[PDB]
């Protein structure tokens, strides 16, 4: 199967540059145009530019000329985009995509944040019902992850072994810090007699936290 | 670059219902292309050169049109069709996309399951106090959440976040966090999460009393 593996979430400072990569597999890399497409939060898609790795031909949406530079390395089947003079308008998801006679295969996206905010580790707070009481055969617990920057944090329950009944909400930014939460619903004869722990990783601050949810 | 306008911006459709969405261009184009984007994932080709189905696309989908006016049709809506659809043109350079039609699955109404949570002892030791309310698995998405402290609404310091339609039951869920100082939190007794939703004539309420 054709597949594009894109580099991970990245934070860059205003005025700096950033390089994003896209590792291709499943087809003859040299024989197809490979492109980059931008999608900002809640908006449509915008074409940037692309390259034909067979001979190095490269063309751009004129808006991004001198802003974006696309290159491809055929021995490693990898395409790159370099963005310079970064501003807030560059924060977005960037997709690499192949064309045959249409955009037939897409990478999973790379999220770029442009910001001068300070990297900050999360505080992790357990959410449990008041007094440990319940109202029926199910009980909902939660985990509040507050005050961190940049994205992402990953949150799992019991190291991923507890996966059904989970709602993990998108992070909300306020005053340069993110707040995230997650709820988990289990049977009332499950907790507290069995252990439930929220696991939080924030790689930007080199932090992992396990918080066990205790009654009352 | 050619502007493509999609209509409607948002719509919901019941299982089995026929769905038609539109793409309108400022200039004539020889073909239109359609892409599907499911919440949280990359776009995928859906229809190429106006009417050909991309790999894996089920037969209930079709496309047609010409000139400045194109459409994508679903003969009978299924839950897995809920997604954002984009049209796209190569008539001129650069390629451009429409802004999207978001298609939602209309299921039957469901009230939120509401859970309220006091500030943790850990957060209090740092001088802050967040009260959290989860409103889980409701439909439709139209909901209003209010925080009341000792019966007075509190409007500042409220952060809300939502998930898109659940892959299994097509409902929405929402989280609301009200953040106070510890001193503020300790001067009041009653904390209430109040939700207004079409499934109830009265507000849907959960409450607790500090140290009680």
């Amino acid at each position: 199967e054709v597949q594009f593996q894109q580099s991970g979430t990245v934070l860059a400072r205003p005025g700096a540059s950033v390089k994003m990569s896209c590792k291709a597999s499943g087809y003859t890399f040299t024989n197809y145009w490979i492109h980059w497409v931008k999608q900002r939060p809640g908006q449509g898609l915008e074409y940037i530019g692309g390259t034909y790795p067979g001979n190095g031909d490269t063309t751009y949406n004129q808006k991004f000329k001198g802003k974006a530079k696309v290159t491809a390395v055929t021995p490693t089947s990898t395409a790159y985009m370099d963005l310079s003079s970064l501003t807030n308008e560059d924060s977005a998801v960037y997709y690499c995509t192949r064309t045959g006679s249409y955009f037939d295969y897409w990478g999973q996206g790379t999220t770029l944040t442009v910001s001068s905010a300070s990297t900050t580790a999360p505080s992790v707070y357990p959410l449990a019902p008041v007094c440990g009481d319940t109202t029926g055969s199910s009980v909902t617990l939660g985990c509040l992850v507050k005050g961190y920057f940049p994205e992402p944090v990953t949150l799992t329950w019991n190291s991923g072994s507890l996966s059904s009944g989970v709602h993990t909400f998108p992070a909300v930014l306020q005053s340069d810090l993110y707040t995230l939460s997650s709820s988990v619903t289990v049977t009332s004869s499950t907790w507290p007699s069995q252990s439930i722990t929220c696991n939080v990783a924030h790689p930007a601050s080199s932090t992992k936290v396990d918080k066990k949810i205790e009654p009352r | 670059q050619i502007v493509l306008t999609q209509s409607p911006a948002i719509m919901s459709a019941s299982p089995g219902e026929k769905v038609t969405i539109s793409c309108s261009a400022t200039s004539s184009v020889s073909y239109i292309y359609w892409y599907q984007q499911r919440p949280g994932s990359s776009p995928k080709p859906w229809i190429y050169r106006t009417s050909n189905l991309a790999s894996g696309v089920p037969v209930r989908f079709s496309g047609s049109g010409s000139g400045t006016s194109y459409s994508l049709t679903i003969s009978n809506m299924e839950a897995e069709d809920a997604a954002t659809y984009y049209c796209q043109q190569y008539q001129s350079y650069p390629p451009t996309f429409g802004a999207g039609t978001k298609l939602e699955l209309k299921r039957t109404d469901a009230a939120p399951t509401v859970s309220i949570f006091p500030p943790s002892s850990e957060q209090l030791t740092s001088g802050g106090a967040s009260v959290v309310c989860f409103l889980n698995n409701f439909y439709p998405k139209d909901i209003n959440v209010k925080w009341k402290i000792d019966g007075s609404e509190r409007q500042n310091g409220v952060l809300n976040s939502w998930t898109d339609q659940d892959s299994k039951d097509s409902t929405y869920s929402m989280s609301s966090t009200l953040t106070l100082t510890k001193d503020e939190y300790e001067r009041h007794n009653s904390y209430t999460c109040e939700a207004t939703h079409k499934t109830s004539t009265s507000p849907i309420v959960k409450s607790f009393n500090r140290n009680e």
Partner: peptide, 10 residues
Amino acid sequence: FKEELDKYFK
């Protein structure tokens, strides 16, 4: 169709 689109990007 691929050749046509390739020329368009070129």
